[PDB]
Amino acid sequence: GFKQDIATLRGDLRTYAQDIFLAFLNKYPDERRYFKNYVGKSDQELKSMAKFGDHTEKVFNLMMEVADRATDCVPLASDANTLVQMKQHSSLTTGNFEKLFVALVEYMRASGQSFDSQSWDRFGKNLVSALSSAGMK
């Protein structure tokens, strides 16, 4: 279930984080504009750039902490507030987060593995609700 999926992802967090983040950019290529240093770089080039593996791992670490603090896939409002208030997220809207979760769920469904994809979709939906409540447009 969802708690085991947090353990699966955490066990190899850097690999999964890079794979899901690239699935997100490759499904929604216009999102790459937010990461000016990733423009024009192949997947293997990105994995040679310190900030790429460090960015993706730190993003997914925080995602897993939010996921683990949730109850029945409902995240804490304080965690949504952290995400809205980050200076790096100041220009984003909830649709940017929707796209990330659509890509994450698609990745899990296409994976060899028994992720609880439905729970990740519901977690993403509940997180988007919380982001909106916390002020994200």
* Contact residues for ligand HEM, defined by CB under 6 A: 31, 34-35, 51, 54-55, 58-59, 62-63, 83, 88-89, 92, 96-97, 100
Q: Is residue 53 a contact residue for a copy of itself (CB under 8 A)?
A: yes
Closest listed residue to residue 118, CA positions, set 128, 127, 109: 109
How far apart are alpha carbons 103 and 27 in whole angstroms? 7
45 lies in the site for a copy of itself, by CB under 8 A: no
14 binds a copy of itself (CB under 8 A): yes
* Rounded Cα–Cα distance for residues 134 and 137 (Å): 9
List residues binding a copy of itself (CB under 8 A).
7, 10-14, 53-54, 57-58, 61-62, 64-65
Binding site for heme b: residue ranges? 36, 38, 51, 55, 58, 88-89, 97
